[PDB]
Design an enzyme around this catalytic site. Structure first.
Site, mmCIF file in Angstrom:
data_model
loop_
_atom_site.group_PDB
_atom_site.id
_atom_site.type_symbol
_atom_site.label_atom_id
_atom_site.label_comp_id
_atom_site.label_asym_id
_atom_site.label_seq_id
_atom_site.Cartn_x
_atom_site.Cartn_y
_atom_site.Cartn_z
ATOM 1 N N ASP A 1 18.438 -24.867 1.175
ATOM 2 C CA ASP A 1 18.760 -25.064 2.582
ATOM 3 C C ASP A 1 17.978 -24.192 3.545
ATOM 4 O O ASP A 1 17.910 -22.970 3.395
ATOM 5 C CB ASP A 1 20.255 -24.877 2.815
ATOM 6 C CG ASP A 1 21.090 -25.657 1.837
ATOM 7 O OD1 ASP A 1 21.408 -26.830 2.124
ATOM 8 O OD2 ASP A 1 21.416 -25.100 0.775
ATOM 9 N N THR B 1 12.608 -30.550 3.816
ATOM 10 C CA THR B 1 12.010 -30.211 5.099
ATOM 11 C C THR B 1 11.476 -28.782 5.162
ATOM 12 O O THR B 1 10.324 -28.566 5.543
ATOM 13 C CB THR B 1 13.020 -30.423 6.249
ATOM 14 O OG1 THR B 1 12.664 -29.603 7.369
ATOM 15 C CG2 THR B 1 14.418 -30.066 5.809
ATOM 16 N N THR B 2 12.322 -27.810 4.838
ATOM 17 C CA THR B 2 11.907 -26.414 4.875
ATOM 18 C C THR B 2 10.885 -26.056 3.808
ATOM 19 O O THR B 2 10.187 -25.043 3.921
ATOM 20 C CB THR B 2 13.103 -25.448 4.851
ATOM 21 O OG1 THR B 2 14.081 -25.891 3.902
ATOM 22 C CG2 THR B 2 13.725 -25.371 6.233
ATOM 23 N N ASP C 1 23.996 -34.306 1.816
ATOM 24 C CA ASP C 1 22.642 -34.307 2.357
ATOM 25 C C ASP C 1 21.887 -35.340 1.522
ATOM 26 O O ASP C 1 20.957 -35.991 1.992
ATOM 27 C CB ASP C 1 22.004 -32.923 2.214
ATOM 28 C CG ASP C 1 20.702 -32.798 2.980
ATOM 29 O OD1 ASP C 1 20.748 -32.688 4.225
ATOM 30 O OD2 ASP C 1 19.631 -32.800 2.342
#
Lengths: 532, 532, 532
Positions: free
Chosen positions: B60, B93-94, B386
């Protein structure tokens, strides 16, 4: 056991991670060792303190976790593993938190210099899948077949170890459980047995409170002290129309002739109290029950009067079972089923004496008695309920297997045997772990001669198809065989979760060999870190 | 990873700029490295702390950015790049923020001693235009053709990496998503699945909550505990005319005969509750629902009673789908479509048990279950959503292409190939960048043997027209080929933005090699700067 | 073991006395317990520290007393009881200080509330008179009859417990003692064996230094390194008439012709060195031996030269035995009896190699060798001398009796038996004490199974006329019987004093239940007291 209170340094965290896991292990190992010391069957005395307070205990995990507030961001994290297992309560749980908290050592070292614990995770879960397997009888000797009263005495043998009666306090607390088992809602049963012990002059043998305690109060002053056989009544909250709802905005404008309005209002409640007496019930119970004027009327018509706020007593009353679903405002005649008429044995011990009559009906009954005094009793009082409650959850179907008495020591030999399957990495940390699941039932051993492993070879003898049981600590060192109370646990289930809490927590407890943080405040008061 | 908490010096900014960009790079590089460590497919454990708190996480980005509050006016600036990509959520994404945050290094150095990054900007955007190009299938092997359930399992393979079930928790969470996909509003679908897991005794395998959870409450005390098959009712908020609206200014001026007014008001609500019962619905739901007097009436006429403030439950109720558009004050007879009558399995786990009946209708349903306990579950519970949500957004057309499994490594060889076009300056920092887009899929690699690039030559073999896929970390080092779960991502889209967030942010992150400020307060408390 | 360093309060004394004796007992008991922990046959490791220093030890009382400087005016007072027994050294002494320091407990309590210890004193001394009685053989089994070499091995069995060779380092150190016993002056014998071990490359088995080490020096530089078989010489200090005695007051008034006076003086010493060479001895030994000019002459005529201050070497030389009674200034021809000619095995280990030739004569010889390295050896090196020295004192006549192996446990039953004599008060604290003299040989026990007294009943069996011996700690629990090395001590004498030091000190340690002082300075810096 050094570094008092987490050594009290490293104020608000920082630094690098790969030495931190070893640090997490150190923090988890220390708290696990202090608890291990005389916990579970070792169980005895762990001394407490604080700034003006008391918490004497034995075999309890929630109590030890209630304390040592933080001391490292690792101790708090794994308080919850005990806490997660605490749901579906018991005392053998934290003893199992020790077994989980131990092998992780031979596992942290394990393959010394390997970044992949991902292998060890496949192992612990595999041990758990084996756990559901051993749930099905592996003991063979006791199996499941034995009187259920036996398994009941078994729990009374453990009690909370610090038990006053190293024996038959048993069926006393059990009959109430035998009743509780009929309810079997999973929780409402533990709600009935709920509350106390003691509250009596001296100590000694007493128990049960048979069918109904349900209330706590000498019942308000008029004459609750007298009127034996008050009778069946079950009014649980009379409130008055105290000329209030009103607020009006304006009311009673004109003067003089108020001699009517004053007398009429007292009259309005006197008629509603006279009609309630028509029920021929008489006894009154009430949180918001003060009706002073028509209370004197109720005194004449209803033995006594009561006055304040115990709601849990009403739910306990729902257990008294006087149909008290509907009780708002006025006129309800149909319901009154609560027991008989005999009530309140007056003035013993002190403060309040209260237990209701008994017109037979098994459940929804209370459980508390004189037993022993507060502090010496607090502990024996609770542990015995944990005894009555945990057995209550497992008594239902889906399980069959003798527990304890090293049934585990060889359950683990099976785990070491499965290591025959060459791949789960190679090392089979699953097996290397099994070795620990074999070493722990021995950590339980406590001492006997001195140290241990002397008796382990003793357990190895006679289990190939024979079965494990009887290992005890009392003077007679029992290798195996009957009535040593074997492993009191059957309900053996708790191991199902005692085994699981390990695999889940121990994995995320490890693989976490990074940063260990340099955290900015989320709580308070914190800001900045000091070390670089 | 030195200079703890931004070294904690340079209190409120000042000084000259051309060493400051190198300083911005240093600040952006450090936070990018700490996150890179076990993030994305590496994913595992990143330890947290603070002054009394907990935030365990994996894969995350929003969580890591939730923290490290400031430490330099450069770290905060680029928290938002992750944040911008966080909209249209995901975890990959990260990991992509890391790829963007890396090449800027060979780019900051790049043409060492050149003031014009204006060339590098033309490049990153060009790589993005190539990104929209590779969106159209470049994979060829999987292409887009495969069962959608496959792509669903793919997301369950990733989960949040720290997934308990390294496999099929899949279609459990997916059927609910298969239902969610029918809604396809882009957000209302993620609103239905919304809320929990756990809230059950122990752990293990459980899921779905099929068609409706919609409420949270044991439902107020009367007897919500009983009355199975309460029935279809869908009153979502009964309020009473508590003699209030009034304030009057003045009211009830004259005394005595109030014996009518008191009885009549209770009467006014008793008739409105009797008519609502005429619906033969019975069950009550309500935020502002306390009607105590005609609640006892409702107790007789409506199984139970409820009492307070959960609005999200009403919107969740709009999903239960009992037509509850109109519900003000009185008399509405036409609507009552909410499911069947079977309700509330009582007392398991603890506190509250609440899930409504089921009279079939696919969507607008809930999604939560016993699964696992709070902390160990918190993370697996969210990551799987998610998993259920990100897949939901992309599944709706416009995209076809196998993702991951180094599909990128050679997407980049194409980028290096376009460098054939002689001018974008000369250096083609676009290409030099491509080189990094080639080095990053390798940074993902994590380890395998040791370090890397050993397997890069392995990827080079068989892609000219063959295609990329299968590079894995599990014991079996997969060069390429099928069911290694390839690059689980197809929905490959996220790269579209993962590629863009880079080009935009990385450009204004650079070219900013001036001042670095000596700022006067806009926030507080600040004033003056110290250094000259 | 609480109240760190005497709790560090009560700075410079004051207060009332009757609680102070209990305080003296507390202070004496604590230091006696810390020492008891692994001392004597328990013997192993007691960890030391300080501000930059080292003192590792085992079985030694003087070392423990060397420390804990004060901590109460009671601890210092009774350091001396160990110290008094330390004269006529040994290690079994402080183990005996523990036996004395223990019963005083059942004795301080004793007749709880009696001011007269005057009775207890008559008892301890009576036990001592019994001690001189049991000195005469009470053992019977070994009696005194056994090879003396046996009693020698016995001391090597004890050594210092932490002995490297749990066996025969024996006769090595013993032959030198067998020689030492011929001297038998009571101290000059321990003076010859005196000095070292180690001082060699590596470790392993080596010993004796046969007849003469007597010197420490590579011997001054010329060529001590060479000239093997330097020969018999025994000049132990050549000094020169360095033109000094003089001071004159005035001398050498006239100039020029000094060419004679300078040459003549060097000439004066050259003739005295040439005559000393006439002895045909050659080797030189000397504290104040530098004669540089006629040293070069001595270099030609006397192999080498030496230079400084070791007097103990000369007394050690008196032991080399070269008649060196007269050695002042000049001309003495008659004496030269020191051994043969073979000297100095060059350069091993480092620094200096020095041991003289051997032309047989039993005593007045040295004792040191390579053995083991400094710290690990320091302890084994010394304990073995205590082994060689204590046995040396007692080997002479006046004693006969088997020691240890609980010979004491029943010596005490005799003491308990004498309690038959009704009066020594009544309580016969002499007997009540005996009980302790019976409990202590058990405190020695250390553990075996666990705790003790299990083996005490074992000792009771077979002693009425059978005799006590063999109680051991090695795996084989020996009840009684031969070669368990019985009680190694015979020389049993040490008990004679170990028994006495108790009766004297323990009495004045008690009966001192007054004031405990509020002392004004005699030392410094002190003044005033604080508490009232």
């Amino acid at each position: 056991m050094s570094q008092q209170p987490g050594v009290l340094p490293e104020n608000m965290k920082r630094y690098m991670g790969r030495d931190a896991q070893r640090m997490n292990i150190l923090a988890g190992r220390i708290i696990a060792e202090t608890v291990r010391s005389t916990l579970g069957p070792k169980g005895m005395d762990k001394m407490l303190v604080d700034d003006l307070g008391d918490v004497v205990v034995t075999n309890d995990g929630v109590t030890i976790l209630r304390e040592m507030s933080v001391e490292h961001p690792a101790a708090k994290m794994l308080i919850e593993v005990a806490k997660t297992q605490e749901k579906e309560v018991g005392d053998g749980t934290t003893t199992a938190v020790v077994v989980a908290g131990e092998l992780l050592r031979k596992a942290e070292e394990l393959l010394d210099q390997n970044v992949h614990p991902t292998i060890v995770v496949k192992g612990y879960q595999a041990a758990a899948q084996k756990a559901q397997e051993l749930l099905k009888t592996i003991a063979c000797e006791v199996g499941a077949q034995d009187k259920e009263i036996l398994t009941k005495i078994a729990m009374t043998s453990i009690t909370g170890k610090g038990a006053e009666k190293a024996k038959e306090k048993l069926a006393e607390i059990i009959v109430e459980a035998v009743s509780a088992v009929v309810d079997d809602e999973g929780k409402v049963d533990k709600d009935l047995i709920k509350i106390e012990k003691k509250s009596g002059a001296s100590i000694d043998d007493t128990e049960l409170i048979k069918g109904v305690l349900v209330d706590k109060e000498r019942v308000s002053a008029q004459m609750p002290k007298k009127v034996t056989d008050a009778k069946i009544a079950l009014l649980n909250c009379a409130i008055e129309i105290k000329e209030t709802e009103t607020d009006a905005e304006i009311r009673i404008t004109d003067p003089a002739k108020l001699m009517e309005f004053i007398e009429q209002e007292e009259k309005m409640l006197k008629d509603m109290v006279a009609e309630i007496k028509a029920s021929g019930a008489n006894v009154l119970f009430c949180q918001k029950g003060i009706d002073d004027l028509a209370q004197h009327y109720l005194a004449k018509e209803g033995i006594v009067a009561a006055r304040r706020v115990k709601k849990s007593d009403m739910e306990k009353l729902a257990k008294a079972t006087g149909a008290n679903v509907i009780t708002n405002i006025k006129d309800l005649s149909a319901q009154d089923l609560g027991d008989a008429g005999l009530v309140e044995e007056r003035k013993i011990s002190g403060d309040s004496m209260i237990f209701v009559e008994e017109c037979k009906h098994p459940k929804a009954v209370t459980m508390l008695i004189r037993g022993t005094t507060e502090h010496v009793i607090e502990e024996v009082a609770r542990a015995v309920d944990d005894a009555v409650g945990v057995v209550g959850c497992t008594i239902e179907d889906g399980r069959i297997v003798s527990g304890g008495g090293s049934t585990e020591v060889e359950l683990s030999m099976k785990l070491r045997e499965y290591a025959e399957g060459i791949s789960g990495r190679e090392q089979l940390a699953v097996r290397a772990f099994a070795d620990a699941l074999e070493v722990i039932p021995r950590t339980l051993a406590e001492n006997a001669g001195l140290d241990a492993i002397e008796i382990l070879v003793k357990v190895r003898a006679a289990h190939a198809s024979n079965g494990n049981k009887c290992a005890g600590l009392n003077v007679f060192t029992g290798a195996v065989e009957d009535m040593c109370e074997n492993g009191v646990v059957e309900p053996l289930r708790v191991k199902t979760q005692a085994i699981q809490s390990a695999a889940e927590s121990t994995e995320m407890l490890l693989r976490i060999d990074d940063v260990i943080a340099a955290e900015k405040l989320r709580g308070a008061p914190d800001m900045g870190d000091m070390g670089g």
